[PDB]
Amino acid sequence: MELQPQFNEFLANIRPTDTQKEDWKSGARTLRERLKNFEPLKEIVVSTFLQGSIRRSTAIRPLGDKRPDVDIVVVTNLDHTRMSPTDAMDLFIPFLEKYYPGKWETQGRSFGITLSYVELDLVITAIPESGAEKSHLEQLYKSESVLTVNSLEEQTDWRLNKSWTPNTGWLSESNSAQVEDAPASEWKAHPLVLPDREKNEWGRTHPLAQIRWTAEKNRLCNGHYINLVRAVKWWRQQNSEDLPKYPKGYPLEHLIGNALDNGTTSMAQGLVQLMDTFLSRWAAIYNQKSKPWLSDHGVAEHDVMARLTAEDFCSFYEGIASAAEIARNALASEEPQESAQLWRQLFGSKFPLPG
Ligand code: NA
């Protein structure tokens, strides 16, 4: 059976709690506000925005001593062609030393700030364009759709468009018309550049395209996509000893989004469909003992699975193959208790029994 109320309760159980949601909101709010008002950086800092699984509403509740994490991307106007990545990153060391002494560390492509209630990542980026194209891109990056403080789940009406404005419950004759994503010719081939200290160069990154694709795929799947990502992450967590360390995080989310068809009608149907499609689509790659290439949504030349090994991918494929038999039999069951017991064999005790 589909057991839609049971899946709703399960999802409520595996989402980040209200306390954790407020914690990441508070942390990001404070960090961005202190960045905004820091005089030594007001010339280079164009804007800031949120990225990460919590921003995309594809994150599950942290377990035990782990804390929620969000990334604050800092869009600057630095010239990446005339400044080394390390210099651009070190421009932000006085800020961290003033506001987060003893709690920040330098990482490969960002800074990591560790608070007791949240973990923050400060991502310094630059705009490669110049002139009118840079002006239009800055118009986009200063819009309310980019600056938003709400997660994807909290704003169904969100689009990647500089004309989009948030809605607080009610609005009528003013503007009840839904805007759409800006045409791809305005952003798709315009990624930001990001310092890489271990490679010592500026690489391309396009978080806005990733967020936009996530939101559109959730709309095309009637809001089931982010919840399916969460459910699969929870399944992986409950069976971590039987699964390889990777894929996890965004590569796992990307695999899920690739496997899932549009038009999903329920969580159970979506799970079975995405698992069957994953198994048939990558059966040849798996038999080759290889791994698939899957391009990043914003940088087509980047492979999301670049760091995944073929061995880990094939181990994960076998894990999905074992989970898919349980999922198919759970969906096919016509008894509520049997169906819920199979769903619980997949997901654990956070999935409830009807009675
Ligand atoms: Na798909």
Curated annotation (Swiss-Prot):
Changing residue 30 to K: No longer interacts with Cap2. Mg(2+) B binds at residues 69, 71. Pfam families: SMODS (PF18144). ATP donor binds at residues 53, 56, 69, 71, 210, 233, 250, 304. Binds 3 Mg(2+) ions per subunit; 1 is probably structural, the other 2 are probably catalytic. Changing residue 69 to K: Nearly complete loss of enzymatic activity. In bacteria expressing cap4-dncV-cap2-cap3, this protein is conjugated to a number of other proteins by Cap2, probably via this protein's C-terminal Ala residue. More conjugated DncV is found in the absence of Cap3. Primed for activation by Cap2 which conjugates it to cellular proteins; activation is target protein-specific (green fluorescent protein does not activate the enzyme), but which protein(s) activate it is unclear. Induction: Part of a CBASS operon consisting of cap4-cdnD-cap2-cap3. One of its GO terms (molecular function) is ATP binding. It is an enzyme of class 2 (transferase). The keyword Kinase does not apply. Cyclic nucleotide synthase (second messenger synthase) of a CBASS antivirus system. CBASS (cyclic oligonucleotide-based antiphage signaling system) provides immunity against bacteriophages. The CD-NTase protein (CdnD, this protein) synthesizes cyclic nucleotides in response to infection; these serve as specific second messenger signals. The signals activate a diverse range of effectors, leading to bacterial cell death and thus abortive phage infection. A type II-C(AAG) CBASS system. Belongs to the CD-NTase family. D02 subfamily. Monomer. Crystallizes as a Cap2 homodimer bound on each side by a CdnD monomer. This is Cyclic AMP-AMP-GMP synthase. It comes from Enterobacter hormaechei subsp. hoffmannii (strain UCI 50).
